[PDB]
């Protein structure tokens, strides 16, 4: 029972300041699954309609670039985070019904599984907190 | 002419003087007990009715005019409470100073007769 | 339109710039507060009565006299004591620093510098000590300065085409200078006859960089065309008490912007100048409103309530 750690923060995820494109969203991006290309048609038609506004097209152009670099890697982690998400809880599930079953069928005396039974209650404690 | 206008160093000299709380407290005290006059608390308003006469200044206004600009907006930068109200208290013994020190019967009888 | 009350005194409220081709209207801005022993140079998102987020602040020696944006993360601040500042805001940990400084932009003993305004890598300054800076972003020194360059307090200053500039005074003159220039008198001043009023904000208009906006002592807009005389073209009643500042539209400046000391914030509504109708904004009840930022629908105004009032929605 070692798997379950929040100090990775799988949930939490740092946010770039994202001056530019942060009003393109996943909507149609999206079983979790965020399409990469939905997002990269909508910021290659983005980047062609602010090259022909002719307002300082080449100079801004890497962050555009840059930007779409990050973000790539941003739905990568979203992607995995869920998968590792998922993973997770069918894990947690498994384990709760395994130990279910264990204590539901068990004929065996009480008083020696006592110490089983306050360790496991020190284990959930801060699971539940 | 503190070495400019002798009408804008003067409103300089009173927010140099503003900031923080001792030395304001300081002046206000200075001010309050020169608003005392010598033979204690009726005429002979206590100050020189010539106060200000050379330059274009309405006397002794200006002092009060600043005292009370402070004591409405400059208690908000006050963090201890204990100089907040010490500075108040200051203030309001400024106030009864400057208000028991106006005749009233005097001023009625004036008006009347 | 909303007002949020923040426990000081503002003198300067602006915009951030937006990102170059951003869709999004403007959300976050700077103030500057005045007449307290520790005055702050500020900076606020608003949130989507509002919600506000204080980003970051910074202490602020001197009065913020004025204040202006010379790219995304550098301010530019004006002090009583005489000092130009440019801090440089950290996005990634929301902290301000002092990028660099002239602390001694203005003097005579501590002189204040009265007007800043930007044009990157430019800063041009004015002060009480009737001195015209250009400084240049790193750069230790002055490019140049006109020393002694006017006689009356200069209040504030404007580009008209860099380095050209125009600046006026406590006796309503208007004066054109240039950085190029030999000696330390204007190549035009331009006035208006009979009172010398105080002029105490400048703008000029965004497209046509021959025309300004001036506010006077006397609450009055006047608007003045470089190429037509020393007269203004236009004289306009206005505030029943000073006017401290004016903004045309940056978009469109058929509409233009003023506030006073009498506590009320226009809108102005030609839709020209030369190349009207008028709304008055804030409540009846308003103590002086220092000053006004506009960009696309966005509007900012601080007080000496203590309150800053905003709406992102002027045209809707």
């Known amino acids: 029972?070692?798997?379950?750690?929040?100090?990775?923060?799988?949930?939490?995820?740092?946010?770039?300041?994202?001056?530019?494109?942060?009003?393109?969203?996943?909507?149609?991006?999206?079983?979790?699954?965020?399409?990469?290309?939905?997002?990269?048609?909508?910021?290659?038609?983005?980047?062609?309609?602010?090259?022909?506004?002719?307002?300082?097209?080449?100079?801004?152009?890497?962050?555009?670039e840059l930007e779409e670099k990050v973000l790539i890697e941003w739905l990568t982690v979203r992607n995995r985070a869920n998968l590792l998400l998922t993973a997770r809880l069918n894990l947690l599930q498994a384990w709760a019904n395994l130990l279910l079953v264990m204590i539901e069928s068990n004929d065996f005396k009480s008083t020696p599984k006592m110490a089983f039974l306050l360790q496991a209650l020190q284990a959930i404690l801060p699971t539940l907190e | 002419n503190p070495f400019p206008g002798p009408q804008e160093c003067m409103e300089m000299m009173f927010r140099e003087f503003g900031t923080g709380f001792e030395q304001s407290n300081?002046?206000?005290?200075?001010?309050?007990?020169?608003?005392?006059?010598?033979?204690?608390?009726?005429?002979?308003?206590?100050?020189?009715?010539?106060?200000?006469?050379?330059?274009?200044?309405?006397?002794?206004?200006?002092?009060?005019?600043?005292?009370?600009?402070?004591?409405?907006?400059?208690?908000?930068?006050?963090?201890?409470?204990?100089?907040?109200?010490?500075?108040?208290?200051?203030?309001?013994?400024?106030?009864?100073?400057?208000?028991?020190?106006?005749?009233?019967?005097?001023?009625?009888?004036?008006?009347?007769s | 339109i909303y007002a949020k009350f923040v426990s000081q005194k503002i003198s300067k409220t602006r915009w951030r710039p937006l990102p170059?081709?951003?869709?999004?209207?403007?959300?976050?801005?700077?103030?500057?507060?005045?007449?307290?022993?520790?005055?702050?140079?500020?900076?606020?998102?608003?949130?989507?009565?509002?919600?506000?987020?204080?980003?970051?602040?910074?202490?602020?020696?001197?009065?913020?006299?004025?204040?202006?944006?010379?790219?995304?993360?550098?301010?530019?601040?004006?002090?009583?004591?005489?000092?130009?500042?440019?801090?440089?805001?950290?996005?990634?940990?929301?902290?301000?620093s002092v990028n660099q400084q002239w602390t001694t932009a203005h003097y005579h003993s501590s002189a204040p510098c009265t007007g800043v305004v930007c044009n990157n890598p430019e800063i041009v300054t004015v002060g009480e000590d009737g001195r015209i800076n250009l400084f240049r972003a790193d750069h230790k020194e002055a490019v140049r300065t006109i020393d002694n360059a006017d006689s009356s307090t200069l209040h504030a200053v404007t580009f008209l085409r860099t380095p050209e500039i125009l600046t006026v005074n406590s006796i309503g003159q208007l004066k054109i200078w240039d950085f190029r220039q030999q000696g330390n008198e204007p190549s035009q001043i331009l006035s208006l006859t009979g009172d010398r009023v105080p002029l105490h904000c400048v703008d000029r208009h965004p497209n046509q960089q021959h025309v300004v906006a001036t506010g006077g002592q006397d609450g009055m807009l006047s608007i003045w065309d470089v190429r037509q005389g020393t007269m203004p073209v236009s004289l306009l009643k206005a505030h029943e008490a000073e006017m401290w500042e004016v903004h045309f539209h940056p978009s469109n400046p058929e509409h233009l912007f003023t506030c006073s000391e009498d506590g009320s914030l226009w809108h102005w509504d030609a839709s020209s100048w030369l190349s009207i109708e008028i709304t008055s904004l804030l409540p009846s009840r308003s103590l002086s409103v220092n000053t006004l930022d506009v960009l696309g629908p966005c509007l900012v105004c601080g007080t000496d309530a203590e309150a800053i009032y905003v709406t992102r929605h002027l045209f809707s």
């Open chain 1, 1 to 64: 029972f070692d798997f379950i750690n929040t100090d990775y923060k799988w949930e939490e995820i740092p946010s770039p300041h994202f001056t530019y494109l942060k009003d393109l969203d996943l909507g149609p991006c999206i079983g979790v699954h965020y399409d990469i290309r939905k997002a990269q048609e909508i910021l290659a038609l983005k980047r062609k309609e602010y090259e022909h506004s002719q307002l300082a097209t080449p100079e801004f152009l890497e962050t555009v």
């Open chain 2, 26 to 112: 300081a002046f206000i005290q200075l001010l309050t007990t020169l608003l005392v006059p010598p033979e204690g608390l009726n005429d002979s308003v206590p100050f020189p009715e010539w106060l200000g006469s050379s330059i274009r200044t309405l006397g002794i206004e200006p002092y009060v005019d600043f005292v009370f600009d402070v004591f409405a907006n400059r208690t908000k930068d006050i963090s201890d409470p204990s100089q907040l109200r010490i500075l108040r208290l200051s203030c309001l013994d400024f106030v009864m100073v400057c208000l028991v020190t106006f005749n009233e019967d005097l001023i009625v009888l004036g008006h009347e």
């Open chain 3, 20 to 96: 170059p081709g951003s869709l999004q209207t403007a959300e976050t801005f700077a103030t500057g507060s005045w007449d307290n022993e520790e005055n702050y140079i500020s900076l606020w998102s608003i949130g989507d009565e509002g919600d506000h987020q204080l980003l970051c602040d910074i202490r602020h020696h001197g009065d913020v006299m004025d204040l202006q944006f010379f790219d995304q993360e550098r301010i530019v601040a004006a002090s009583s004591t005489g000092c130009v500042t440019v801090f440089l805001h950290h996005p990634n940990n929301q902290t301000l």
